[PDB]
Amino acid sequence: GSILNDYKRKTEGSVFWAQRARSVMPDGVTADTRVFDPHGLFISDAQGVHKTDVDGNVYLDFFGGHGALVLGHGHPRVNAAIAEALSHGVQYAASHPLEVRWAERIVAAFPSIRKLRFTGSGTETTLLALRVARAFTGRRMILRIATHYHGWHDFSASGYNSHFDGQPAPGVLPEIAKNTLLIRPDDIEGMREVFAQHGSDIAAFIAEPVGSHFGVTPVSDSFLREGAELARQYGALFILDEVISGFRVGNHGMQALLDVQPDLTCLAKASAGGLPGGILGGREDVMGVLSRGSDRKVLHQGTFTGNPITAAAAIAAIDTILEDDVCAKINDLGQFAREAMNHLFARKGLNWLAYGRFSGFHLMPGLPPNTTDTGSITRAEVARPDVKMIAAMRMALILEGVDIGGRGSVFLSAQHEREHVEHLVTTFDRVLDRLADENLLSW
Amino acid sequence: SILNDYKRKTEGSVFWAQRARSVMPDGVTADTRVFDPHGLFISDAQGVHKTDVDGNVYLDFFGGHGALVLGHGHPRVNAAIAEALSHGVQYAASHPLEVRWAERIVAAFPSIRKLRFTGSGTETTLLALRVARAFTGRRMILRIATHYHGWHDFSASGYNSHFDGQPAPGVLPEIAKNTLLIRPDDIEGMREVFAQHGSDIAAFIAEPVGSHFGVTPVSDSFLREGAELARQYGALFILDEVISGFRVGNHGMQALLDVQPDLTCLAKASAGGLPGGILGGREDVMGVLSRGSDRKVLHQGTFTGNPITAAAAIAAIDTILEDDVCAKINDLGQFAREAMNHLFARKGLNWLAYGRFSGFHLMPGLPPNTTDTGSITRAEVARPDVKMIAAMRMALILEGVDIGGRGSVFLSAQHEREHVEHLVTTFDRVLDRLADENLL
């Protein structure tokens, strides 16, 4: 009768597949975000805002795509473009028109971008951005905000979810950590002091807007604006990681809303139409280090970079997002969802808070739902929610036919509607009661 | 004139190149695509043929850079892709196709007990060097000059520049400081390096066959020698099978070398002709990617292991084994080298078609009856002029044929002997054109 036991009985097909996965993969998964004790779902189908597991259970999905699926699962305009491109080849050992057309839409949406190059992933994008910044400036050091996520490569793996003392994570050359400067989010005096001491040796200041993982740990717009101006003053490149915000918060990225012009912008996920790929774009002179005729030439290649299948999906997705005014839709739905959740928490006498911006929200157990200032989250002053409770919450939602991400994050898509959000609220009501039944809530 | 005819035939590509140059460095998204005055813009490919925006059809010998073992749009592969598309792309969860794909990898490579999917071949070798350093606690990497493992910071210096050991632009000089470069087949120097630094070497990584699948050949015995030295000094051995995987044979190059690498890198053909990569190897080595490892290496990827790539990989692998594709393209590759060298001999030309398995490379300046590539491996033969190679590629395009950058050819399951003979017949005229313009 426990949540854990109900979970195991409803997802019996997923424990069978999890066991096969564990014999060939570490922790039975191919990505750390998929680790889930005792086992995760194995999905065999997804359409619209629903996905189906190997047992036939249907779930209302709020996280599939990790933000890439701004248009939802199998949007017919995207899938038709993919199907059409597939009937014409994948790799020509040559240029092709669809990469140009894709590129022209990126340049039209981000005036800061005059030149770009496609990459294989969001992680390759930020990796290339750091290489380009170091090669352009001739400098050594990278300035990162602690907790901000830019991928799993060597230069962003230390100080993300560990090693906040500047030490190198396992396998990271200590010289890489030695050449990384970490500042805490919204710590302005620290940032001014880091530039005062190291400004001339900083190749780039890279930051994720909204905050770590699209606002799980909020960072203020004004903190990024001042960081961008200090980088400009000292000759460091400002790199804005718009992998999640791109073509989700608005038609012109987060940088339009911040009123900054980054020297480099990293894009992937929705900017790639929901298929593998990434995009690095930025200043004409900076991107010149990728030209064959540069004295600071950075080597960049990639077999499937810019491939026509991804490009067709991105062309179709970008055009649909602009034409159907999707960003404004999901921004309104996200605000509706945050108010509905916080009304629920107050209704039930629970000190939980739904926070965030734009097309989703995050949950912070232990803060009142009428909280206005997320500063205690940014300063890591609030206590970490019990890990058993978070796990039980995710399992109980699955029992009720809903799936969210992480420790309580939601993304909304063009195919979500107010009714779906209201079902989410109704579902959470039951889940919170089940967590109380097992004495997992704190008060 | 070759250059003027090229321009007149590819008018539509010049139009598109003009739009590309507004938005991309050099009008391309990959260094390998840079071509003066401009490259072809391709809008369709099927089988072994591709068509440019002007409607010209080309017999293709390089599409996929090796990944298209099965050619353009193989029916089984495209059907599987189309089916998987209709069921979703990203579930924020695991799915059966990645397991089924993984189980085929482990069945072909017994050395791979655990594996992780990645987004590309470049991500695979990046992850492999991290895993090796985390597992051993060592700093230094040994690799072979000219060998290509991607464009990330740990394999960019000493690939086509900075052979003295200095850092390429943007590479932390400390990364170059932590890289050891040895010339291919320089067995003497390899033992010297392990003697001076063996205890600090995390991994020896090498591409089999040679740089870019044999452009600069490396010997099988040299790789075996290195794999032994590494195991003897406590260093890992990383075999980069991104090109050889599911091309040379059903069990990779490592089965032909009789070696068990501690880590194996796969992509291109192992991912079914779609974006993706695979890192696999020893149980204890791959354990650094486990939640509860004392040496945890963070790894993630939004579209890593996605069901579209997995669907293509499953169908491609099953087709390659079921239709005995590797034996066929290996046989065709041997004929191609024989036919080309027969042509060079009939023409009294001092060129050599060399290589192994399902392709060949061209070396101007060596007799076609050469049996020892040592002069190529040791950089003793002057690498060919670029103006000649570019003119040659342009001339082949004028005849309806396309090959790889430096004069290399990959063969697929849909190539036949008649396609190779047409290639030879076309090379005959092109060589005569290059001579008429005094470009040989």
Encode chain B in three state secondary structure: CHHHHHHHHCHHHHHHHHHHHHHCHHHCCCHHHCCCCCCCEEEEEEECEEEECCCCEEEECCCCCCCCCCCECCHHHHHHHHHHHCCCCCCCCECHHHHHHHHHHHHHCCCCCEEEEECCHHHHHHHHHHHHHHHHCCCEEEEECCCCCCCCCCCCCCCCCCCCCCCCCCCCHHHHHCEEEECCCCHHHHHHHHHHHHHHEEEEEECCCEECCCCEECCHHHHHHHHHHHHHHCCEEEEECCCCECCCECCHHHHHHCCCCCEEEEEHHHHCCCCCEEEEECHHHHHHHCCCCCCCCCCCCCCCCCHHHHHHHHHHHHHHHHCCHHHHHHHHHHHHHHHHHHHHHHCCCCEEEECCCCEEEEEECCCCCCCCCHHHHCCCCCCCCHHHHHHHHHHHHHCCEECCCCCEEECCCCCCHHHHHHHHHHHHHHHHHHHHCCCC
Q: What is the SS3 assignment for A363? A: strand
Residue A276 has its nearest CB partner, among B135, B275, B295, at: B275
Q: Is B300 left (phi over 0), alpha (psi -120 to 50) or beta?
A: beta
Residue A291 has its nearest CB partner, among B26, B93, B295, at: B26
Whether residues A203 and A184 fall in one domain: yes
Contact present, A427 and A61 (Cβ < 8 Å): no
Contact B153 A154 (CB under 8 A): yes
Nearest CA in chain B to A175: B174
d(CA B140, CA B155): 12
Contact B131 A171 (CB under 8 A): yes
Q: Which of B190, B192, B197 shows the shortest CA–CA distance to B206? A: B190
Contact present, A120 and A332 (Cβ < 8 Å): no
Residue A154 has its nearest CB partner, among B130, B159, B302, at: B130
Q: Is the dihedral of CA A106, A110, A113, A114 positive or negative?
A: positive
Cβ neighbours of residue B435 closer than 8 Å, sequence gap 6 or more: none
Min Cα–Cα distance to chain B from A181, Å: 15
Q: Could you give phi then psi for residue A355, rounded to 5 degrees?
A: -125, 175
DSSP string of A27-61? GG-SSGGG--SS---BEEEEEBTEEEETT--EEEE
Cis peptide before A365 (omega within 30 of 0): no
Contact present, B218 and B377 (Cβ < 8 Å): yes
Cβ-count burial B146-170 (b if 16+ within 10 Å, e if not): bbbbbbbbbbbbbbeebeeeebbbb
Beta bridge pairs of residue A144:
A182, A206
Q: What is the SS3 assignment for A70? A: coil
- Number of C-beta neighbours around residue B371 at 10 A: 8
> Which site among B21, B54, B91 would you substitute to test the A interface, given the most A Cβ atoms closer than 10 Å to its Cβ?
B91
Contact A104 B19 (CB under 8 A): yes
d(CA B87, CA B90): 10
Whether residues B291 and B335 fall in one domain: no
Whether residues A2 and A24 fall in one domain: yes
d(CA A123, CA A125): 5
Tokens representing B36? 């003066």
Whether residues B413 and B264 fall in one domain: no
Residue B308: CATH number of its domain: 3.40.640.10
d(CA A96, CA A94): 7
Whether residues A130 and A107 fall in one domain: yes
Min Cα–Cα distance to chain A from B332, Å: 21
Distance (Å) of CA A11 to CA A15, A56, A58? 7, 9, 11
- Radius of gyration of the CA atoms of chain B, in A: 22
Contact present, A27 and A69 (Cβ < 8 Å): no
User: Of A290, A325, A360, which closes a domain?
Assistant: A325
Partners of residue A45 in chain B, C-beta under 8 Å: 87-88
User: Of A325, A359, A374, which closes a domain?
Assistant: A325
Contact present, A128 and A115 (Cβ < 8 Å): no
Whether residues B247 and B359 fall in one domain: no
Whether residues A241 and A101 fall in one domain: yes
The letter for the amino acid at B209 is V
Contact present, A339 and A424 (Cβ < 8 Å): no
d(CA B278, CA B125): 9
Min Cα–Cα distance to chain B from A121, Å: 6
By DSSP bridging, strand A141-145 and strand A180-183 are parallel
Contact present, B409 and B393 (Cβ < 8 Å): no
User: Of A325, A349, A367, which closes a domain?
Assistant: A325
Q: Could you give phi then psi for residue A202, rounded to 5 degrees?
A: -90, 115
Whether residues A198 and A256 fall in one domain: yes
Residue B20 has its nearest CB partner, among A95, A114, A134, at: A95
Contact B151 A309 (CB under 8 A): no
Nearest CA in chain B to A160: B298
Whether residues A219 and A276 fall in one domain: yes
Q: Which of B125, B173, B174, B130 shows the shortest CA–CA distance to B150? A: B125
d(CA A407, CA B369): 67
Whether residues B119 and B225 fall in one domain: yes
d(CA B369, CA B210): 20
Q: Which of A361, A320, A77, A59 shows the shortest CA–CA distance to A216? A: A361
Partners of residue B95 in chain A, C-beta under 8 Å: 42-44
Using CB atoms within 10 Å of the CB of residue A134, give its burial: 0 to 12 exposed, 13 to 18 middle, 19+ buried.
buried
Contact A95 B289 (CB under 8 A): no
Whether residues A284 and A408 fall in one domain: no
CA A296 to chain centre: 31
d(CA A302, CA A125): 12
Contact present, A381 and A364 (Cβ < 8 Å): no
Contact present, B290 and A27 (Cβ < 8 Å): yes
Contact B298 A32 (CB under 8 A): yes
By DSSP bridging, strand B216-217 and strand B210-211 are antiparallel
Contact present, B390 and B439 (Cβ < 8 Å): no
> Which site among B147, B300, B396 would you substitute to test the A interface, given the most A Cβ atoms closer than 10 Å to its Cβ?
B300
For A259, the enclosing helix (H) or strand (E) is none
Nearest CA in chain A to B273: A90
Min Cα–Cα distance to chain A from B266, Å: 13
Residue B123 has its nearest CB partner, among A51, A124, A306, at: A124
Domain span at residue A377?
Answer: 1-74+326-443
By DSSP bridging, strand B263-267 and strand B236-240 are parallel
Tokens representing B47? 């089988």
> Distance between terminal CA atoms of chain B?
15
Q: Is the dihedral of CA A279, A284, A289, A294 positive or negative?
A: positive
d(CA A164, CA B429): 65
Contact B42 A95 (CB under 8 A): yes
Please tell me the total count of domains within chain A. Answer: 2
Using CB atoms within 10 Å of the CB of residue B188, give its burial: 0 to 12 exposed, 13 to 18 middle, 19+ buried.
exposed
Write down the residue that tokens 């291109």 correspond to. Answer: B268
Contact present, B84 and B310 (Cβ < 8 Å): yes
Partners of residue A110 in chain B, C-beta under 8 Å: none
d(CA B295, CA A169): 8
Resolution of the deposited coordinates, in angstroms? 2.2
Using CB atoms within 10 Å of the CB of residue A269, give its burial: 0 to 12 exposed, 13 to 18 middle, 19+ buried.
buried
Residue B95 has its nearest CB partner, among A44, A179, A305, at: A44
Min Cα–Cα distance to chain B from A349, Å: 31
Q: Could you give phi then psi for residue B52, rounded to 5 degrees?
A: -90, 175
Min Cα–Cα distance to chain A from B126, Å: 8
Q: What is the SS3 assignment for A382? A: coil
Q: Is the dihedral of CA A145, A147, A152, A156 positive or negative?
A: positive
- Number of C-beta neighbours around residue B284 at 10 A: 12
For A365, the enclosing helix (H) or strand (E) is strand A360-365
Whether residues B169 and B305 fall in one domain: yes
**Alpha helix (H) residue ranges in A159-252:** 174-178, 188-198, 212-215, 221-234
